[PDB]
Structure formats: C-alpha cells, structure tokens
C-alpha cells in the first residue's frame, strides 16, 4: 500500500466491499447461496460469526443438483427476503445450469446474483464528480457499450437482473510474503495448463495468460508502481510481457505521465527499481516431481490442500495471522521438528491455555504423521528417496532399469502415481530414451494397468515429459549430467533429496555468477551487478533450449527493492523454501532485495497426474 506493499492490508478491502454489498441488498432476513468452488475462498476471509453479526444473513448453502430435490424442501422453506446467488464466471465463460433450471421450475419472483471481477483501476475514483454533469451532457454512457458480456446468454424468465459487481484483488493466505491467485482451475476441476483434451490447448493458454495479465495489471495499478526492468524467460512469457506492456501503455490515465516525466525522466533518476522476472513451468520439468521433505511439503502430498489453506480430516485452521507456533515450523525440515517441539514444551513447564492447546494439537499431529510415515509400506518413503538420488546423478546401466522398476511394483504395494512419476523422471533425466525400451515399458504398463493407459502414455508423450530418441513451446533438449557441471545443484539445500532446483540457479545467475565462475568461465562482464543483465550467457542457454531467443531483456524507463517473480504454471512449494534462503544469502552478500512470489495455484506431482488422465 502506497509504494510499500502491505500485503495484509489487501484483505480488508474485499471483506469491506462484500459486507457493504450484502448489507445494501435488503434489511431483512437473507439466505446466501454460494458456488461450491468459491465458497472455501470466502470462508477463509470472513468467519461465520462475523458474517452473522455484520449483515442480517443467517443461512449459507451450496450449488448442487441436490437443491433441485430440495427446491420444495429448502428453497420452498426459509426465503424470508430473497435468494442471493454467488457465482464465478472469470473462467469457462458459462453459468452453471443449476440456477437456470431452478429459476424456471421453482419460479422465483426476485433474482439477484453476485459476479466477481478484478478492480477497475481505470475508473480512477469515479473520475472526480462526472465533471459537473459532464459539462452539459458532453459525455454519456447510455448504449455506449455492448449489450452484455458473458451474461447475454441469460435472456429467459423474468427481467430480475439486479447484478452486483463485487470487487476482488489478490490477498495472501498461506504466508505473509506470498500472495496467491486462483486461475489454474475451472469449475469442473480441470487443470488450466494441462487439460485432459488434446484439441484446444492454444485457446486455454491464451485465456490463462490473459487472466494472469489482468491480475498483474490490477495489482500494479493498485500499488502505483513503475516497472523498470523485465527479464522474460520462455516463449509464453514473451507474449505475456508484450501484452502487459501494450495494455499498460494504452489504458493508463493522465496526471501520471506527468509524474513519469518528473520522476525518472531524461538525464536524471531517483534510484527506484522494480524487477519482473517471469518463468514458465515447462522450462524445468525436472523438479515438480521430486519428493517433498519439508513439513508442509510432507503434509501437502499426503493430504491435498483445497482452495482454502486447510484440510478436511483435521479441524484446526493453519492460518498464520492468529498462531505463531505454525509460523516457526511450517518450512523447517521434518527431522528438526521433534527436538524443537520437545524444547518448546519443556520451556513452558516452568512458566495462556490457548498456547497449551496449540502445542498439544501440534504434538498429536506430528506424532500421527510420524506414525503414518512408517508401517505404511515400510521403507518405500526412503527407498524412493535413495532411488531418486541415484538417478539424478546418473547410474543407469544396460537393461538393469527393467529389474528395479518392477522390484517395488508388487514386492511392496504402491500406487500408480508413484510409478508413473518415477518413470517420467527416468525418461526426462537422460533427455532421451532409446527405441528398444518403450516396446517393453509400454507393454508392461498396458499389461498391468488396463487398456486406457495407452491413451495416457500417448497424450503425455507430446508435452515433452515422455519423449523418444528417434511454436516449439520451449522444451528442454540437453542432458542433465551436463547441467550438473555448469551448475552446482548436487554438492545448503532441503525440501528435496539434497538437490538445488534448476529455477534456483537460473535466478541465481541473473545477479551473481559465482557458481558459473567456478565451471565454464574465463571472463565475465561483472561479478556483482545491482540491475538485472544478461550478456555473454547465450550459447549455454542456446543449446539448453535449441534457440537463442528464449531469453528476453526489456528496459522500459528511458535513461529497498521489490521483485515480482510471478509463476505461470504453479509453484512447487519447495521452491518457496529456497526463495527465503536466497533472500537471506543475497542480503548477507551485500545486495538487499525483497521477493514477492505471485502464484496461479499450488502445483504438485500427484495433483498433476490426475490432470492428464
């Protein structure tokens, strides 16, 4: 807020707007009807008690076909004032049929709905006071617009179209530092980047990039920032950067270009820098599939977080704004939790009961997790780690891989997803697999897991995960054993099998070429540069991607620090753990910066496997 990104301050605006709208609906007893996908987000913002006390609504429901049978049971009952639906139409451009069938059948006499949208900063605070009646109606907005958007398909029943545009802007839930935008799923639980229908990839990609650009524009115009340097990586990031630049340069108002002349300008500057490094998940498919070792990573891949940051099996919330025990243990390694918990418990003995309840709950949950790690296919949780560590450095032999893949297939029972992920990593690590092993691996797969597995192994065999030795979308076509020489991923590191992520070193090289100095270096343009630059580092990335055009460096202004590292394609939460380590080590070395990680939705190995199915 006001050039200082007070992230928690973003939370209040959405709640205030929703409360004002709901209280301005009607001063009676209201019943709320909320879409299943958006409800968890709303509950993570407004508590039930606050919702009841602030506005006279007293009931919340869900959009389901069960309501059709309950139309004469639930909808017929209550209905003290009216029914206020809440829908999300930001993606999939289609209203759910539930409201369509309920409107005509139950014959509601008052239809009011709520639709979500990003904040229209271009409205610039209603533009003063309409310029004293538009200086004699010199400007007007009647019919100066298309008749309807998306909701033009709603042209049935009555004219009760009291729409209400509730505003929404990103706010942090999992942690103070990192915000999160939900644009990676539809209402049908289909991945927005890896859809299970290989006929409409291009449109889905365009829609995703458009929505991401819209969210970034909303945040940028809300915070009143001036981007100075852009480091785009990949193909889609190029289009995203160009579209964002065009949209910023088109829709910006006046009274700020004048400031753009005063600040920065010609022959002078004021020492303000913001960076917009952008990456794509397809660039490095090496590390969304490794096993998590941090506490929240282990707790995540065994029990999937929903849209809200909570879990079904437990009841206590993991929100950071009311508890401090979770703050200091979320990103620590699993091994260093026990003794720390023992010390925390023993120090309080000499020494309010809410802390006791919190520590008891944490101890019980940790004990349950430790118990469930073992005795549940004992040794698998470690065996996969040793196998992954062996594969990453490279120890594959002639036809011996077929012996170990089925070694744990039925000796220890294991899910399909683990095997599929491991074989994908095997096929991806060597950057190529010969033509004499697919004929056996695919045969065994189709033998053991049905007939539909052939379709999965065919569809997944074109995104780059499952390739054969015999508009490129920026795949990776270089052996990984080479990358272990330029970079020092395998020696400082946690949340993995002792391996540094590839994105980690990719962002490291932009500011300090130390590891690149040890290997493949005789001269460098610099050793410590404050501004992001890319020079004399083309050939290494020319062979790494097959084209010396993936790297893009853009300077916008002609002539401590906020860096916006967005993530198009999900964030593997282990990267968040190493981001803090990067910030700490860079601050120690001398360069002081602050990182904000924009995420389109948490991504994880198993969560990917159901996507392409």
């Amino acid at each position: 807020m006001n050039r200082f990104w007070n992230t928690k301050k973003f939370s209040l605006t959405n709640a205030d707007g929703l409360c004002a709208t709901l209280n301005e609906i009607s001063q009676n007893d209201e019943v709320l009807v909320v879409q299943p996908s958006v409800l968890p987000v709303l509950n993570s913002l407004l508590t039930f008690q606050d919702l009841t006390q602030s506005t006279p609504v007293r009931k919340i429901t869900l959009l389901d076909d069960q309501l059709s049978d309950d139309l004469p049971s639930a909808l017929g009952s209550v209905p003290q004032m009216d029914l206020i639906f809440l829908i999300d139409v930001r993606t999939s451009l289609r209203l759910p049929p539930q409201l369509l069938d309920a409107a005509q059948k139950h014959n509601l006499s008052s239809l009011h709905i709520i639709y979500c949208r990003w904040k229209p900063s271009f409205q610039n605070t209603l533009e003063d006071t309409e310029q004293w009646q538009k200086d004699g109606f010199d400007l007007n907005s009647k019919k100066t617009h298309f008749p309807n958007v998306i909701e033009s398909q709603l042209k049935e029943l009555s004219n009760e179209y009291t729409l209400y545009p509730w505003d929404l802007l990103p706010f942090p839930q999992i942690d103070e530092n990192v915000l999160l935008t939900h644009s990676l799923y539809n209402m049908e639980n289909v991945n927005m980047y890896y859809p299970n229908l290989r006929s409409l990839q291009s449109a889905t990609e365009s829609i995703l990039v458009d929505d991401m650009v819209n969210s970034l524009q909303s945040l940028i115009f809300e915070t009143n920032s001036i981007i100075t340097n852009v480091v785009s990586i990949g193909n889609l990031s190029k289009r995203c950067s160009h579209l964002l630049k065009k949209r910023i340069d088109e829709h910006q108002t006046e009274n700020d270009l004048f400031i753009k002349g005063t600040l920065y300008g010609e022959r002078t500057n004021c020492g303000l820098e913001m960076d917009l490094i952008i990456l794509e998940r397809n660039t490095d498919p090496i590390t969304p599939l490794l096993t998590q070792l941090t506490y929240a990573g282990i707790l995540d891949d065994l029990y999937e977080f929903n849209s809200g940051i909570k879990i079904k099996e437990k009841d206590m919330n993991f929100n950071y704004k009311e508890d401090k025990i979770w703050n200091d243990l979320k990103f620590l390694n699993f091994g260093s939790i026990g003794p720390q918990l023992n010390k925390l418990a023993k120090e309080l003995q000499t020494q309010l009961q809410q802390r006791q309840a919190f520590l008891k709950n944490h101890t019980t949950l940790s004990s349950d997790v430790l118990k469930v790690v073992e005795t549940e296919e004992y040794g698998s949780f470690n065996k996969i780690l040793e196998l992954e560590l062996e594969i990453l450095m490279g120890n594959t032999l002639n036809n011996d891989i077929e012996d170990i893949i089925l070694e744990l297939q039925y000796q220890y029972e294991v899910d399909q997803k683990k095997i599929l992920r491991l074989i994908c990593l095997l096929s991806l690590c060597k950057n190529s697999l010969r033509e004499k092993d697919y004929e056996y691996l695919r045969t065994f797969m189709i033998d053991s897991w049905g007939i539909e597995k052939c379709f999965q192994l065919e569809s997944l065999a074109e995104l780059g995960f499952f390739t054969s030795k015999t508009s490129k979308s920026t795949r990776l076509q270089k052996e990984y054993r080479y990358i272990s020489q330029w970079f020092n991923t395998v020696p400082a590191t946690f949340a993995y099998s002792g391996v540094v992520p590839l994105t980690m070193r990719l962002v490291q090289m932009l500011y300090d070429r130390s590891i690149l100095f040890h290997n493949y270096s005789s001269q460098q343009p610099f050793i410590l540069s404050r501004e992001p630059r890319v020079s004399q580092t083309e050939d290494l990335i020319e062979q790494l991607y097959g084209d010396s055009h993936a790297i893009e460096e853009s300077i916008w202004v002609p002539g401590e620090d906020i860096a916006l590292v967005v993530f198009l394609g999900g964030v593997t939460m282990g990267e968040i753990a190493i981001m803090k380590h990067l910030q700490k080590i860079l601050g120690k070395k001398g360069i002081n910066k602050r990182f904000i990680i924009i995420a389109d939705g948490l991504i994880n190995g198993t969560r990917i496997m159901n996507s392409i199915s």
Partner: protein, 231 residues
C-alpha cells in the same frame, strides 16, 4: 470506424454496420477473449444457423475458442467434427464419452476404425497394433471364460492370471505365455505372490526366484527355515 481507440465502441459499430466479417479479426487481434465469445453468441443467434460452420472453416482458422465454450453439451460437438472430418477429435470425444459410464470396450471397435484408414503417421500404427493385441486378448478371454462359468469380463492379464494361478490349469496357464510373449523374469515370483497373500508353501516345491523372494516371505508374516542356505 476501425480507427477508434475504445476497444468496445468500434466493435459495436462494425457489427451494427452489417459488415460482420471483420470485427472478429479485430477482436482476435486485440486478444480480449471475453468480448469475443459474447460476439460469437450474438452472431450465432441471428443468421441461417448453418453458415456458422461456413464462416468458421475459412475465417478464424482452427483457433478452438468456440469449441471450448461448448464442451459440456456433447451434441453440437458431434456434427461439427463430423463435417470438418476431424476423425481424431471424434474418436477422442467418443472415448471420453465412454469413459463416463464405466464402459470402454463398447466403443473400442469405433476407435479400431476411426484410427484406421488414417495414412498420416506411424504412432497410430503402434496404437492399432496395441488394439490388435487387445482384440486377441478379448477373443482369448471369451474363449477361456466360457469353458468354465467363472464370470470373466473386462479386467487385465494380471487380474485374470492371479485368479487363474489359484486352481491353476497346467499346460494352459503357461500356454498363453508363448502367445503373448510374457517376460520370464516377471512370472517367476508371481505364483508365490498370488498364493502366500492368502493362508499358504508351494514355493518349497518351486525349486526347479533368485534373491528377492526371501525378503517377500520375510515381509509377509515366522517360519524362516525354508531355503536358508541356497547361497
């Protein structure tokens, strides 16, 4: 009209002028993807209802935007694909439709014919060879499943093999090995896999494998005396 800088007023004017063949190009050029679907909805509702396909073949190229809008209707997605002769798309659509109501073998002959007469690639050749293997498996399943009324249907080889090993048919359970070229290593410690999962020791008379089965008997369950010193 097109020289405007409002991104909505000029879109309205172009369509209102009855020149409804250039505003789509402008909309896809600006890449809004929100007004464009509204324009398609408005344009579809006022015309012969059959020249939409004619417009979409020449204009808009492939760009499956309107196709993505109609994804949960399963009716309009059929005739358009049939007319466009996108047989792969039709095959995938009917495959997904069959995937819904737990029935895939019913739609299998269509895939056997849709992927047939393609003459376009060689991965489809591997797919049709796999389909031939599936057909051979199905005909063998019908052949073996009707001799004894054991209710054999769908399932995979291992599912059929696991129950077949129990009360095994010697010289018949191994007969399929030469027909399907089953790997020797996989089938060695699989009969024990299918036996000791229940209450029993045939592995003792299986000495005609290697290291691993020692651990497997150690894993499940005592009675560690068998085969202590074969090495």
């Amino acid at each position: 009209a097109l020289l405007e800088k409002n991104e909505e007023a000029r879109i309205e004017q172009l369509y209102n002028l009855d020149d409804d063949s250039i505003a789509l190009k402008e909309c896809i050029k600006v890449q809004n993807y929100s007004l464009t679907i509204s324009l398609l909805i408005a344009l579809s509702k006022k015309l012969t209802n059959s020249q939409l396909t004619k417009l979409l073949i020449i204009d808009m190229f492939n760009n499956p935007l309107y196709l993505y809008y109609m994804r949960m209707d399963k009716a309009y997605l059929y005739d358009f694909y049939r007319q466009t002769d996108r047989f792969i798309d039709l095959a995938h659509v009917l495959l997904q439709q069959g995937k819904e109501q737990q029935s895939l073998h019913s739609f299998l002959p269509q895939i056997k014919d849709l992927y047939s007469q393609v003459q376009n690639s060689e991965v489809v050749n591997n797919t049709i060879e796999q389909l031939q293997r599936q057909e051979k498996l199905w005909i063998y399943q019908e052949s073996l499943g009707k001799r004894f009324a054991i209710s054999f249907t769908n399932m995979t080889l291992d599912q059929t093999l696991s129950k077949l090993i129990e009360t095994g048919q010697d010289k018949q359970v191994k007969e399929i090995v030469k027909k399907f070229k089953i790997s020797e290593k996989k089938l060695y410690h699989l009969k024990c896999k299918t036996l000791v999962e229940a209450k029993k020791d045939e592995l003792l008379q299986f000495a005609q494998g290697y290291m691993p089965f020692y651990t497997y008997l150690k894993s499940r369950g005592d009675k560690a005396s068998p085969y202590v010193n074969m090495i």
